[PDB]
Amino acid sequence: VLSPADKTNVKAAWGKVGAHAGEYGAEALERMFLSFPTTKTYFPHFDLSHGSAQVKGHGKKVADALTNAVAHVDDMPNALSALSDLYAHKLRVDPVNFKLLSHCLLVTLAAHLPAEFTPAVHASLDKFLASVSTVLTSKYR
């Protein structure tokens, strides 16, 4: 469960991300494709080269879903319900992969926001990303 401190920490860190959310989403995806090549199996229809427009566009979608979840941190299941339906019925990404992207999102935030990425904030962001991932896979079976 996200504590009061987790919510404060996530809102503060993601607020500092600000206009860079989509760029950081694309960077996290690129980090994941390079570090964990099995994740590319879900994107046979994508140009996965550095800077590709498809990865940029997808990073914006990922980042927007995270921004919305931050704005709905009190009830993420409800805010992410439609996306979780799409995952269960169509996208069907194995749960292990969300841990890989979550780790790459932490790395991306750490590499861009050194003042914000304190140990406590790192802990809260990891809980938040794991909670989002749980919702996304919650209707799989």
């Binding site: 099995t38 199996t41 879900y42 269960a88 069907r92 194995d94 992969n97």
Partner: protein, 146 residues
């Protein structure tokens, strides 16, 4: 992965008793029932809408037999699983785009099917040996991903 000589003998002896017409389809079918999102990879197989439809689907049974034959090839080459599965690894990556995490799921489902088929004879030491086998097969099938 390293099986002891006793483990190799036990795995080989049990495998000789496997129903080659049914065990592979039961493992594939149970994968599709227990982890139903894996049906994404088999849309061309027709009716997968209920457990009974999955397990009785002739394409599930037929494909499962081919999967079982590849497992048999691995059991005959336990010291070279990577070489045995290199061609299928490239296929599952480049042609079929299958996340190799699914190979772990299928391996453990196969272990469940072996326990179901063999009952008492699927002893805890025999299972431990087959866990080494299915992990080695999954690793070998994942090895040529890039």
């Amino acid at each position: 992965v390293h099986l002891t000589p006793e483990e190799k003998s036990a795995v080989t002896a049990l495998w000789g008793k496997v129903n080659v017409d049914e065990v592979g389809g039961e493992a594939l079918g149970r994968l599709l029932v227990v982890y139903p999102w894996t049906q994404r990879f088999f849309e061309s197989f027709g009716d997968l809408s209920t457990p009974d439809a999955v397990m009785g689907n002739p394409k599930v049974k037929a494909h499962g037999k081919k999967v079982l034959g590849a497992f048999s090839d691995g059991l005959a080459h336990l010291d070279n699983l990577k070489g045995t599965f290199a061609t299928l690894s490239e296929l599952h990556c480049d042609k079929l785009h299958v996340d190799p995490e699914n190979f772990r799921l299928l391996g453990n489902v196969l272990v469940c099917v072996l326990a179901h088929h063999f009952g008492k004879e699927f002893t805890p030491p025999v299972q431990a040996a087959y866990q080494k086998v299915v992990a080695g097969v999954a690793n070998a099938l994942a090895h040529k991903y890039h």
